[PDB]
Coordinates of C-alpha atoms and ligand atoms in Angstrom, one line a residue:
Chain A
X1332 CA 0.0 0.0 0.0
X1333 CA 1.8 3.1 1.3
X1334 CA 3.6 3.8 4.5
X1335 CA 3.0 1.5 7.4
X1336 CA 3.0 2.6 11.0
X1337 CA 3.2 0.8 14.4
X1338 CA 2.8 1.7 18.0
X1339 CA 4.5 0.3 21.1
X1340 CA 5.2 1.5 24.6
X1341 CA 8.2 0.5 26.7
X1342 CA 9.1 1.7 30.2
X1343 CA 6.3 4.4 30.0
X1344 CA 7.8 5.7 26.8
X1345 CA 6.0 6.2 23.5
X1346 CA 7.5 4.9 20.3
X1347 CA 6.4 5.7 16.7
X1348 CA 7.6 3.2 14.2
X1349 CA 7.6 4.2 10.5
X1350 CA 8.1 1.5 7.9
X1351 CA 8.7 3.1 4.5
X1352 CA 10.5 0.5 2.5
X1353 CA 7.5 -0.3 0.4
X1354 CA 7.1 3.1 -1.3
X1355 CA 8.7 2.1 -4.6
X1356 CA 9.3 5.6 -6.0
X1357 CA 12.1 8.2 -6.1
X1358 CA 13.5 8.4 -2.6
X1359 CA 15.2 11.8 -3.1
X1360 CA 11.9 13.5 -3.8
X1361 CA 10.2 12.8 -0.5
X1362 CA 13.1 11.8 1.8
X1363 CA 13.1 15.3 3.4
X1364 CA 9.8 14.8 5.1
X1365 CA 11.5 12.7 7.8
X1366 CA 14.0 15.4 9.0
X1367 CA 13.9 15.5 12.8
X1368 CA 13.3 11.8 13.3
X1369 CA 15.2 10.9 16.5
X1370 CA 16.8 7.7 15.2
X1371 CA 17.3 5.7 12.0
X1372 CA 17.1 1.9 12.3
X1373 CA 19.1 0.1 9.7
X1374 CA 19.1 -3.7 8.9
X1375 CA 21.9 -5.6 7.2
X1376 CA 21.7 -9.2 6.1
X1377 CA 24.8 -11.2 6.9
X1378 CA 23.8 -14.5 5.3
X1379 CA 23.3 -12.6 2.1
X1380 CA 27.0 -12.0 1.7
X1381 CA 27.9 -13.8 -1.5
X1382 CA 27.5 -9.3 -4.3
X1383 CA 24.5 -8.3 -2.2
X1384 CA 26.7 -6.8 0.5
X1385 CA 28.2 -4.2 -2.0
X1386 CA 24.7 -3.0 -2.7
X1387 CA 23.9 -2.9 1.0
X1388 CA 27.1 -0.9 1.7
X1389 CA 26.4 1.5 -1.1
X1390 CA 22.9 2.1 0.3
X1391 CA 24.3 2.6 3.8
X1392 CA 26.8 5.1 2.4
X1393 CA 24.1 7.2 0.8
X1394 CA 22.1 7.6 4.0
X1395 CA 25.0 8.8 6.0
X1396 CA 25.9 11.6 3.5
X1397 CA 22.4 12.9 2.9
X1398 CA 22.2 16.6 3.8
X1399 CA 19.0 16.2 5.9
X1400 CA 20.6 13.6 8.1
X1401 CA 23.7 15.5 9.1
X1402 CA 23.0 15.2 12.8
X1403 CA 20.7 12.1 13.0
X1404 CA 21.9 9.0 14.8
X1405 CA 22.0 5.5 13.3
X1406 CA 21.1 2.3 15.1
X1407 CA 22.4 -0.6 13.1
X1408 CA 21.1 -4.2 13.5
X1409 CA 23.2 -7.0 11.9
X1410 CA 20.8 -10.0 11.3
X1411 CA 21.2 -13.5 9.9
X1412 CA 24.2 -14.4 12.0
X1413 CA 23.0 -17.8 13.0
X1414 CA 23.2 -18.9 9.4
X1415 CA 26.3 -16.8 8.9
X1416 CA 28.4 -18.8 11.4
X1417 CA 27.8 -21.9 9.3
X1418 CA 28.2 -20.1 6.0
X1419 CA 31.7 -19.0 6.8
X1420 CA 32.9 -22.5 6.5
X1421 CA 31.3 -23.0 3.1
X1422 CA 32.1 -19.5 1.9
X1423 CA 35.0 -17.7 3.6
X1424 CA 34.5 -14.1 4.6
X1425 CA 37.0 -13.0 2.0
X1426 CA 34.3 -13.5 -0.6
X1427 CA 42.0 -15.5 9.7
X1428 CA 38.8 -17.4 9.0
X1429 CA 36.6 -17.3 12.2
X1430 CA 33.3 -15.9 13.5
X1431 CA 34.9 -13.1 15.5
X1432 CA 37.2 -12.0 12.7
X1433 CA 34.4 -11.9 10.1
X1434 CA 32.1 -10.0 12.5
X1435 CA 34.8 -7.5 13.4
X1436 CA 35.7 -7.0 9.7
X1437 CA 32.1 -6.4 8.7
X1438 CA 31.5 -4.0 11.6
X1439 CA 34.7 -2.0 10.8
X1440 CA 33.9 -1.8 7.1
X1441 CA 30.5 -0.4 7.8
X1442 CA 31.3 1.9 10.8
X1443 CA 34.2 3.5 8.8
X1444 CA 31.7 5.2 6.5
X1445 CA 30.7 8.3 8.5
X1446 CA 33.0 11.4 8.0
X1447 CA 31.4 13.6 10.7
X1448 CA 32.2 11.3 13.6
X1449 CA 31.7 14.1 16.1
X1450 CA 28.2 15.1 14.8
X1451 CA 26.5 11.7 15.0
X1452 CA 27.1 8.2 16.4
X1453 CA 26.6 4.7 15.0
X1454 CA 25.2 2.3 17.6
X1455 CA 25.8 -1.3 16.5
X1456 CA 24.2 -4.6 17.4
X1457 CA 24.1 -8.2 16.6
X1458 CA 20.5 -9.6 16.5
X1459 CA 19.3 -13.2 16.3
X1460 CA 15.9 -14.7 15.5
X1461 CA 15.0 -15.0 19.2
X1462 CA 16.1 -12.3 21.6
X1463 CA 14.1 -10.2 24.2
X1464 CA 16.9 -7.7 24.9
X1465 CA 16.5 -5.8 21.5
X1466 CA 13.9 -3.4 22.9
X1467 CA 16.1 -2.7 25.9
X1468 CA 18.9 -1.8 23.5
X1469 CA 16.6 0.5 21.5
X1470 CA 15.5 2.2 24.8
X1471 CA 19.1 2.6 26.1
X1472 CA 20.2 4.1 22.7
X1473 CA 17.3 6.5 22.3
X1474 CA 17.7 7.9 25.9
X1475 CA 21.4 8.6 25.2
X1476 CA 20.5 10.3 21.9
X1477 CA 17.9 12.5 23.6
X1478 CA 20.3 13.5 26.4
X1479 CA 23.0 14.4 23.9
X1480 CA 20.6 16.5 21.8
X1481 CA 19.3 18.4 24.8
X1482 CA 22.9 19.1 26.0
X1483 CA 24.0 20.3 22.5
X1484 CA 21.0 22.6 22.2
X1485 CA 21.7 24.6 25.3
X1486 CA 25.4 24.9 24.5
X1487 CA 26.6 22.7 27.4
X1488 CA 28.0 20.0 25.1
Chain B
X865 CA -17.7 44.1 17.5
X866 CA -21.2 42.8 18.4
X867 CA -21.9 39.3 19.8
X868 CA -20.9 37.8 16.4
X869 CA -17.3 38.8 16.9
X870 CA -17.4 37.8 20.6
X871 CA -18.6 34.3 19.7
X872 CA -16.0 34.0 17.0
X873 CA -13.2 34.9 19.4
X874 CA -14.4 32.5 22.1
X875 CA -14.5 29.6 19.6
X876 CA -11.1 30.5 18.4
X877 CA -9.8 30.5 21.9
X878 CA -11.2 27.0 22.5
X879 CA -9.6 25.8 19.2
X880 CA -6.3 27.2 20.2
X881 CA -6.4 25.6 23.7
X882 CA -7.2 22.2 22.1
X883 CA -4.4 22.6 19.6
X884 CA -1.8 23.5 22.2
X885 CA -2.7 20.6 24.4
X886 CA -2.6 18.1 21.5
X887 CA 0.8 19.4 20.4
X888 CA 2.3 19.3 23.8
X889 CA 1.1 15.8 24.3
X890 CA 2.3 14.7 20.8
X891 CA 5.8 16.3 21.3
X892 CA 6.7 13.4 23.7
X893 CA 6.4 10.6 21.2
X894 CA 9.7 9.2 19.9
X895 CA 9.7 8.7 16.1
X896 CA 11.9 6.0 14.5
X897 CA 12.4 5.6 10.8
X898 CA 13.1 2.1 9.4
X899 CA 15.4 1.4 6.5
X900 CA 17.3 -1.4 4.9
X901 CA 17.5 -3.6 1.8
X902 CA 14.9 -6.0 0.6
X903 CA 14.8 -9.6 2.1
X904 CA 17.1 -8.4 4.9
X905 CA 14.9 -9.7 7.7
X906 CA 13.1 -6.5 8.4
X907 CA 9.9 -8.4 9.1
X908 CA 11.5 -10.4 11.9
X909 CA 13.0 -7.2 13.4
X910 CA 9.6 -5.5 13.3
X911 CA 7.9 -8.6 14.9
Chain C
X620 CA 44.1 48.0 58.4
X621 CA 47.1 47.0 56.3
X622 CA 46.6 43.2 56.6
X623 CA 43.0 43.0 55.4
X624 CA 43.6 45.5 52.6
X625 CA 46.6 43.4 51.4
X626 CA 44.5 40.2 51.5
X627 CA 41.6 41.9 49.6
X628 CA 44.0 43.2 46.9
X629 CA 45.5 39.7 46.4
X630 CA 42.1 38.2 46.2
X631 CA 41.0 40.7 43.5
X632 CA 44.1 39.9 41.4
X633 CA 43.5 36.2 41.7
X634 CA 39.9 36.5 40.6
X635 CA 41.0 38.6 37.6
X636 CA 43.6 36.0 36.6
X637 CA 41.1 33.2 36.8
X638 CA 38.6 35.2 34.7
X639 CA 41.2 35.9 32.1
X640 CA 42.1 32.2 32.0
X641 CA 38.5 31.1 31.4
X642 CA 38.0 33.8 28.8
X643 CA 41.1 32.9 26.8
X644 CA 40.0 29.2 26.7
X645 CA 36.2 29.6 26.5
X646 CA 35.9 27.2 23.6
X647 CA 37.4 24.1 25.3
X648 CA 35.1 21.2 26.1
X649 CA 35.7 21.4 29.9
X650 CA 34.7 25.1 30.0
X651 CA 31.6 24.5 27.9
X652 CA 30.7 21.6 30.2
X653 CA 30.0 24.2 32.9
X654 CA 27.8 27.3 32.4
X655 CA 29.8 30.2 31.1
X656 CA 27.3 32.9 31.8
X657 CA 26.7 31.7 35.3
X658 CA 30.4 31.2 35.8
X659 CA 31.0 34.9 34.9
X660 CA 28.3 36.0 37.3
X661 CA 29.7 33.8 40.1
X662 CA 33.2 35.3 39.5
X663 CA 31.7 38.8 39.8
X664 CA 30.1 37.9 43.1
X665 CA 33.5 36.6 44.4
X666 CA 35.1 39.9 43.3
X667 CA 32.4 41.9 45.2
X668 CA 33.1 39.7 48.3
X669 CA 36.7 40.9 48.2
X670 CA 35.8 44.5 47.4
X671 CA 33.6 44.8 50.5
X672 CA 36.6 45.4 52.7
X673 CA 37.4 48.8 51.2
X674 CA 33.8 49.9 52.0
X675 CA 34.1 48.6 55.5
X676 CA 37.3 50.6 56.2
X677 CA 36.1 54.0 54.7
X678 CA 35.2 56.7 57.2
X679 CA 31.4 56.6 57.9
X680 CA 29.3 59.1 56.0
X681 CA 25.8 59.5 54.7
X682 CA 26.6 57.3 51.7
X683 CA 29.1 54.8 53.1
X684 CA 26.6 53.3 55.6
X685 CA 24.2 52.6 52.6
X686 CA 26.9 50.7 50.8
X687 CA 27.7 48.8 54.0
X688 CA 24.1 47.8 54.2
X689 CA 23.7 46.7 50.6
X690 CA 26.9 45.0 49.5
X691 CA 27.3 42.7 52.5
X692 CA 24.1 40.8 51.7
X693 CA 24.3 41.4 47.9
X694 CA 27.6 39.5 47.4
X695 CA 26.5 36.4 49.1
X696 CA 23.2 36.4 47.4
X697 CA 24.9 36.7 44.0
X698 CA 27.2 33.8 44.5
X699 CA 24.5 31.4 45.9
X700 CA 21.9 32.3 43.3
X701 CA 24.4 31.6 40.5
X702 CA 25.2 28.2 42.1
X703 CA 21.5 27.3 42.5
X704 CA 20.5 28.0 38.9
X705 CA 23.6 26.3 37.5
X706 CA 23.0 23.1 39.3
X707 CA 19.3 23.3 38.7
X708 CA 19.4 23.3 35.0
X709 CA 21.7 20.2 34.8
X710 CA 19.5 18.3 37.3
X711 CA 16.4 19.1 35.3
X712 CA 18.1 18.2 32.0
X713 CA 19.2 14.8 33.3
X714 CA 15.8 14.2 34.9
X715 CA 13.8 15.1 31.8
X716 CA 14.7 11.9 30.0
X717 CA 12.1 10.1 32.1
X718 CA 9.3 12.1 30.3
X719 CA 10.8 11.7 26.9
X720 CA 11.9 13.8 23.9
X721 CA 10.6 17.1 25.5
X722 CA 12.8 20.2 25.4
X723 CA 12.9 21.5 29.0
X724 CA 11.4 24.9 29.7
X725 CA 13.8 27.8 30.4
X726 CA 17.2 26.1 29.7
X727 CA 18.4 28.7 27.2
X728 CA 21.6 30.7 27.9
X729 CA 19.3 33.7 28.4
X730 CA 16.6 32.3 30.6
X731 CA 19.1 31.4 33.3
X732 CA 20.4 35.0 33.5
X733 CA 16.8 36.1 34.0
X734 CA 16.3 33.6 36.8
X735 CA 19.5 34.5 38.6
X736 CA 18.8 38.2 38.4
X737 CA 15.3 37.7 39.8
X738 CA 16.8 35.8 42.7
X739 CA 19.2 38.6 43.4
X740 CA 16.5 41.3 43.0
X741 CA 14.5 39.7 45.8
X742 CA 17.4 40.3 48.3
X743 CA 17.8 43.8 46.9
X744 CA 14.1 44.5 47.5
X745 CA 14.4 43.4 51.1
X746 CA 17.4 45.5 51.8
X747 CA 15.9 48.6 50.1
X748 CA 12.7 48.3 52.1
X749 CA 14.5 48.1 55.4
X750 CA 16.7 51.0 54.3
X751 CA 13.6 53.1 53.7
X752 CA 12.2 52.1 57.2
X753 CA 15.4 53.4 58.9
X754 CA 17.3 56.0 57.1
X755 CA 21.1 55.9 57.0
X756 CA 22.9 58.1 59.5
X757 CA 26.3 58.7 61.0
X758 CA 26.0 59.0 64.7
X759 CA 28.8 59.9 67.2
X760 CA 28.6 57.4 70.0
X761 CA 30.2 57.7 73.4
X762 CA 29.6 55.3 76.4
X763 CA 28.9 55.4 80.2
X764 CA 32.6 54.9 80.8
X765 CA 33.2 58.7 80.1
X766 CA 36.6 57.8 78.9
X767 CA 35.4 56.5 75.5
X768 CA 37.2 58.5 72.8
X769 CA 33.8 59.2 71.1
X770 CA 33.3 56.7 68.3
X771 CA 31.9 57.5 64.9
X772 CA 29.3 54.8 63.9
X773 CA 26.6 54.2 61.4
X774 CA 22.9 54.5 62.5
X775 CA 21.1 51.2 62.2
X776 CA 23.5 48.4 61.2
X777 CA 21.3 45.7 62.6
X778 CA 18.0 46.8 61.1
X779 CA 18.1 44.6 58.0
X780 CA 20.3 41.7 59.3
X781 CA 17.7 39.1 60.2
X782 CA 15.8 39.4 56.9
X783 CA 18.8 39.1 54.7
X784 CA 20.4 36.3 56.7
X785 CA 17.1 34.3 56.6
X786 CA 16.9 34.7 52.8
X787 CA 20.5 33.6 52.4
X788 CA 20.1 30.6 54.6
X789 CA 17.1 29.5 52.5
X790 CA 19.2 29.8 49.3
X791 CA 22.0 27.7 50.8
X792 CA 19.6 25.0 51.8
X793 CA 18.1 24.8 48.3
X794 CA 21.6 24.7 46.8
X795 CA 22.5 21.8 49.1
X796 CA 19.4 19.9 48.1
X797 CA 20.0 20.4 44.4
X798 CA 23.6 19.3 44.9
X799 CA 22.3 16.1 46.5
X800 CA 19.9 15.4 43.7
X801 CA 22.5 15.4 41.0
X802 CA 25.2 13.1 42.5
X803 CA 24.8 10.4 39.9
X804 CA 25.6 12.5 36.8
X805 CA 28.7 11.9 34.6
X806 CA 32.1 13.1 35.7
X807 CA 32.3 16.5 33.9
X808 CA 28.7 17.4 34.8
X809 CA 28.9 16.3 38.5
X810 CA 30.0 18.7 41.2
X811 CA 28.2 17.6 44.4
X812 CA 31.3 17.0 46.3
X813 CA 32.7 20.5 45.9
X814 CA 29.3 22.1 46.8
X815 CA 29.1 20.1 49.9
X816 CA 32.6 21.0 51.0
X817 CA 32.0 24.7 50.2
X818 CA 28.8 24.8 52.3
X819 CA 30.3 23.0 55.2
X820 CA 33.5 25.1 55.3
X821 CA 31.5 28.4 55.1
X822 CA 29.2 27.3 58.0
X823 CA 32.3 26.4 60.1
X824 CA 33.9 29.8 59.4
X825 CA 30.9 31.8 60.6
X826 CA 30.4 29.6 63.7
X827 CA 34.1 30.3 64.5
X828 CA 33.4 34.0 63.9
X829 CA 30.7 34.3 66.5
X830 CA 32.7 34.0 69.8
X831 CA 35.6 36.2 68.7
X832 CA 33.1 38.9 67.9
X833 CA 31.4 38.6 71.2
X834 CA 34.5 38.6 73.4
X835 CA 36.0 41.7 71.7
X836 CA 33.2 44.1 72.3
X837 CA 35.9 46.6 73.3
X838 CA 38.4 47.9 70.8
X839 CA 36.0 48.0 67.8
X840 CA 39.0 47.9 65.4
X841 CA 39.4 44.2 66.3
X842 CA 35.8 43.5 65.4
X843 CA 36.2 45.2 62.0
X844 CA 39.3 43.2 61.2
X845 CA 37.6 40.0 62.3
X846 CA 34.8 40.8 59.8
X847 CA 36.9 41.7 56.9
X848 CA 39.0 38.6 57.2
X849 CA 35.9 36.4 57.5
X850 CA 34.3 37.8 54.4
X851 CA 37.6 37.4 52.4
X852 CA 37.9 33.8 53.6
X853 CA 34.4 33.0 52.5
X854 CA 35.1 34.3 49.0
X855 CA 38.4 32.4 48.9
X856 CA 36.7 29.1 49.9
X857 CA 34.2 29.5 47.0
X858 CA 36.9 30.3 44.5
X859 CA 39.2 27.4 45.6
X860 CA 36.5 24.8 45.7
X861 CA 34.8 25.6 42.5
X862 CA 37.4 26.8 40.0
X863 CA 40.8 25.3 40.9
Chain D
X717 CA 41.8 4.8 45.1
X718 CA 41.1 1.4 46.7
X719 CA 37.5 0.0 46.5
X720 CA 37.1 -2.7 49.2
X721 CA 33.5 -2.4 50.7
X722 CA 31.6 0.0 48.5
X723 CA 34.7 2.2 48.5
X724 CA 34.9 3.1 52.2
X725 CA 38.5 4.4 52.0
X726 CA 37.4 7.7 50.4
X727 CA 34.8 8.1 53.1
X728 CA 37.5 7.7 55.7
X729 CA 39.5 10.3 53.9
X730 CA 36.5 12.7 53.9
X731 CA 36.1 12.2 57.7
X732 CA 39.8 12.9 58.3
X733 CA 39.8 16.1 56.3
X734 CA 36.7 17.5 58.0
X735 CA 38.0 16.7 61.4
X736 CA 41.3 18.5 60.6
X737 CA 39.3 21.5 59.5
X738 CA 37.3 21.5 62.8
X739 CA 40.4 21.3 65.0
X740 CA 42.2 24.0 63.1
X741 CA 39.2 26.3 63.5
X742 CA 38.8 25.5 67.2
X743 CA 42.3 25.7 68.6
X744 CA 42.9 29.5 68.5
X745 CA 39.4 30.3 69.8
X746 CA 40.3 28.9 73.2
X747 CA 43.3 31.2 73.7
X748 CA 41.4 34.2 72.2
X749 CA 38.5 33.6 74.6
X750 CA 40.7 32.9 77.6
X751 CA 39.4 36.2 79.0
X752 CA 35.8 35.0 79.5
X753 CA 35.1 31.5 80.9
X754 CA 31.4 31.0 80.0
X755 CA 31.9 31.4 76.3
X756 CA 35.1 29.2 76.6
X757 CA 33.1 26.3 78.0
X758 CA 30.3 26.8 75.6
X759 CA 32.6 26.7 72.6
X760 CA 34.5 23.6 73.9
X761 CA 31.2 21.7 74.4
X762 CA 30.0 22.7 70.9
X763 CA 33.3 21.7 69.3
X764 CA 33.3 18.3 71.0
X765 CA 29.8 17.6 69.9
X766 CA 30.5 18.6 66.3
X767 CA 33.7 16.6 66.3
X768 CA 31.7 13.5 67.1
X769 CA 28.9 14.2 64.7
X770 CA 31.3 14.6 61.8
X771 CA 32.7 11.1 62.2
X772 CA 29.3 9.6 62.7
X773 CA 27.5 11.2 59.7
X774 CA 30.5 11.1 57.3
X775 CA 31.4 7.4 57.8
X776 CA 28.3 5.5 59.0
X777 CA 25.7 7.1 56.8
Ligands
ZQY921 C1 25.7 30.4 56.4 C2 25.3 31.9 56.4 C3 26.5 32.7 55.7 C4 26.0 34.1 55.6 C5 26.3 35.1 56.6 C6 25.8 36.4 56.3 C7 25.9 37.6 57.0 N1 26.6 37.7 58.3 C8 27.2 38.9 58.8 C9 26.3 39.4 59.8 C10 26.8 40.6 60.7 C11 27.6 40.3 61.7 C12 28.1 41.4 62.6 C13 27.9 42.7 62.3 O1 28.4 43.7 63.0 C14 29.5 44.3 62.5 C15 29.3 45.6 61.7 N2 28.3 45.7 60.9 N3 28.4 47.0 60.4 N4 29.5 47.6 61.0 N5 30.0 46.6 61.8 C16 27.0 43.0 61.0 C17 26.5 42.0 60.3 N6 25.4 38.8 56.5 C18 24.7 38.7 55.3 O2 24.2 39.9 54.8 C19 23.4 40.6 55.7 N7 24.6 37.6 54.6 C20 25.2 36.4 55.1 S1 25.1 34.8 54.3

């Protein structure tokens, strides 16, 4: 259809959730409507590494350098790791073979794509199919972002 | 300004009070945009 | 008279040096971490605390007694009001995250100045009212011991004391409470320890002042020196705890 | 800088500093008030009570 929206409340805090990926039109024409959104939640497929990851990295690069998103914070979720651990053996991460090395290399090759390091931060996470601590991570990141913005506005930071 | 203007300004004041209350309430919601590539497990993340 | 004057001059020079240091480096992260506008106001209050000695050694006149009545309360009020507002905005900022994504009211670099000036103006109002009730005057007092080389004194030194003192004590209590509330903040934004030590040391100094003032009712000169030294010491305690 | 039981060492340090301050303030007052006995006893009593209260509140709170 169009844009899909969801509500959920956590720790007496209100959360608007905007799914927009189904628009299927020119992103640059309407992307500016979302200036001022507190956080951007990105999702990266790990098991789709052999190249889909080049496309995913290019898409990530574009979002960081958009002019509207100069000061917005990025929350990154790395999914499909349960299959990734087994896929390393069949397809090495070069396409020091290990789970930790591949995870660190992926994390570094993404996190090294924001020039204005001082302006914004890139929270990073590893998510599995089943985990109840994801919402706690979102809460603990959003509160930090809010505090940083309030401090920067008054000149204290 | 006969009673017509008085009624108009009273109604305008009620509208402005309602708008201010709604905006103050709605300034507390935390908005989160979702992005990624297709078939990247976004449905599982949302669920 | 030489001693207290020398101490006051040294204190004024030290305050000027500290102010010049903060000005030169006003863009560094640690200076921005603290309020700059309230830091300047607090430094001005410390400077006035030192300057009060010259007023208290000048020959009494129709104008000098008025300055003696105003500045004494005004300096303390300035310093404590600055501390109260500075700690308050940080406490509210770190407490506001519970509500969520709501910009706190009156946290601009200009609203704080307004609040601090209002708090000072309250004390100014009290002092001016009591000044209107009893006009300043320069009496020449002599005592039942006919010997007394007639002394030259102000008219009603004690008229406004209790009101100003009560106000200042209320401000100190509020400052201590807001220092307690903010003990869990990050390192650069947390100063509860220094505020506690400042308040404790100041209270100790004035408690020590009391008996020396009582026992030296004779030889007024001793009383004046034991008030100039106490005021300068209070200013120095504030400066050392907060800025060093 | 030694955390043993909820970092009591720094609390001991705070108690020591405060007691030093109280004793420094009190010692000259006795000689200055040697002239009058009533105020001398009153100040001694007040100083002793405060010296106990500092240790109590600073360390055991
Ligand atoms: C913890 C609380 C600290 C404070 C203390 C304090 C204070 N105390 C000084 C009071 C005093 C003592 C002897 C005097 O007699 C001497 C004299 N006076 N004129 N000529 N000789 C006069 C005044 N004054 C004021 O402002 C009013 N604010 C404060 S805040």
